[PDB]
Write a protein that binds this ligand. Structure first.
Ligand SMILES: Oc1c(Br)cc(Br)cc1-c1[nH]c(Br)c(Br)c1Br
Ligand SMILES: Oc1c(Br)cc(Br)cc1-c1[nH]c(Br)c(Br)c1Br
Ligand SMILES: [K+]
Ligand SMILES: [K+]
Ligand SMILES: [K+]
Ligand SMILES: [K+]
Ligand SMILES: [K+]
Ligand SMILES: [K+]
Ligand SMILES: [K+]
Ligand SMILES: [K+]
Ligand SMILES: [K+]
Ligand SMILES: [K+]
Ligand SMILES: [K+]
Ligand SMILES: [K+]
Lengths: 209, 209
């Protein structure tokens, strides 16, 4: 209990457009807020949208903190990290554009994160996927990554230190953890944990809700 | 001109539910029918749904043929193959659940198929995809395959012969071509070439049309 710090990424506005009268960002916010394991939520957002979350500070059973977004995703994660409790045992990074994440699946990835040191929710890739070389020729089990991405703070800090001191290039595919020798566990999630951005995605969310 | 035999897979009913008053299967049917390169379309469908395509036989500028569906996808392809013109230089296999395929992209994959011997329409995978081992740990450029999948008939026949004589297992991922040493080219397609099956997918198709 109270061992997990959530970093909620909401500074990328697609994540504020409403879902049944509630801005998309608030759905996972509340999901995390109700979990006894969660000590605090560090919201990473433009100071302008701070009010959206601030209104509920008294009603929620977690600590609320704020951090400023960075240039790209890893910078926003670093910003959030600077704000987490000194004693938290787990960092739970979540894309707020993912509103329908189930409590049971968050529980699963937290458990796997605590056990392994790093865990991410994923589902088997439904599409037929092939590796293709530079000559556009096919190179003769694949999983789609979701969020939360759960990592012990010491490991995350070491990962940032490794990238900075060596000047390593970070992309969405080649993230901080890809450079570490520490294992990353894939917790099996639900296909309903979609990223809601396009109008096509938003009508699906209502059906799931 | 008149060098390509299309195998239209329509015996898998999701592919007959209407799109703006026209059954989904008829969209690519007509797209192929208008291309001068296409000699014939072999429709692979339950004899029950033969009428859907038969009504237009006189108005279309291609030969129409019919074949019986098999147990799985490769069996249906084999069935269609038995019906193609003895002199066609290219087989163009298409999933009829893909209605919005553009003429320009079909032209592209036919060209690449003629050049290389085998080509498939694909798009870069938008999702973050990782390889995961048997212990559910991340294994530290990926493309999503679409259709048409274009192959020279001799190569396709050899591929079927290789699988039968050796008793090789065929899956959607490990298809006939995966066993051949002959190169497969990935022609860059459009994200609009979606597989239309779910109600969520059908409303998207109208927007694209
Ligand atoms: O890409 C991953 C994965 Br596959 C698993 C975990 Br656990 C964390 C990250 C990650 N993503 C960002 Br952005 C940062 Br920083 C980190 Br660490
Ligand atoms: O899976 C592919 C690919 Br990636 C490229 C081409 Br060209 C053809 C196939 C294929 N699919 C089936 Br079903 C059969 Br039979 C064959 Br051959
Ligand atoms: K709590
Ligand atoms: K979601
Ligand atoms: K959310
Ligand atoms: K979920
Ligand atoms: K364990
Ligand atoms: K999407
Ligand atoms: K024609
Ligand atoms: K399509
Ligand atoms: K079609
Ligand atoms: K297309
Ligand atoms: K060429
Ligand atoms: K789909």
């Amino acid at each position: 209990e109270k061992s997990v710090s959530v970093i909620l990424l909401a500074g990328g506005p697609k994540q504020y457009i409403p879902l049944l009268g509630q801005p998309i960002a608030l759905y996972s916010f509340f999901t995390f807020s109700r979990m006894p394991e969660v000590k605090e939520i560090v919201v990473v957002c433009d100071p302008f949208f701070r009010d959206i979350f601030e209104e509920y500070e008294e009603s929620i059973d977690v600590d609320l903190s704020f951090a400023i977004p960075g240039k790209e995703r890893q910078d926003s994660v670093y910003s959030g990290l600077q704000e987490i409790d000194v004693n938290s045992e787990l960092v739970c990074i979540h894309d707020s554009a993912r509103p329908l994440v189930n409590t049971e699946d968050v529980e699963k990835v937290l458990k796997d994160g605590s056990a392994v040191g790093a865990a991410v929710l994923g589902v088997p890739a439904k599409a037929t996927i092939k590796e293709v070389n530079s000559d556009s020729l096919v190179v003769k089990t694949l999983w789609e990554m979701q969020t939360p991405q759960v990592i012990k703070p010491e490991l995350l800090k070491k990962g940032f230190e490794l990238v900075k001191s060596e000047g390593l290039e970070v992309t969405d595919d080649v993230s901080i953890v890809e450079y570490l020798k520490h294992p990353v566990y894939v917790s099996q999630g639900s296909y309903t944990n979609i990223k809601v951005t396009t109008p096509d995605d938003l009508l699906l969310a209502e059906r799931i809700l």
